[PDB]
């Protein structure tokens, strides 16, 4: 599928509402494995299990290890652009 850019809106007290797997040390993209019901990723309607996260907020995640991707993702606030692809 095509690259999509999806805007997620989260309030400061909530999480992103995703679980992720993969990353550079696994030789596969950062991948959404869960979408948590009622949380920001669920609510925006444009993020899905199976999506690769290529970038978040202009931060390239194509070549980032899992832990660093988790950290960057967890630092995001407010209106957040996800660059994703389901290949």
């Amino acid at each position: 599928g095509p690259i999509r850019k999806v805007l997620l809106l989260k309030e400061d007290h909530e999480g992103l509402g995703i679980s992720i797997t993969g990353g550079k040390e696994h030789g596969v993209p950062i991948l959404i494995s869960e979408i948590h019901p009622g949380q920001p990723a669920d609510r925006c309607g444009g993020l899905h299990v199976g999506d690769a996260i290529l970038a978040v907020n202009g931060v390239n995640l194509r070549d980032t290890k899992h832990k660093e991707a988790v950290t960057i993702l967890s630092q995001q606030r407010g209106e957040i652009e996800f660059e994703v692809v389901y290949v």
Binding site: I18, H36, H66
Partner: peptide, 4 residues
């Protein structure tokens, strides 16, 4: 998986 990590939860975020």
């Amino acid at each position: 998986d990590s939860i975020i």
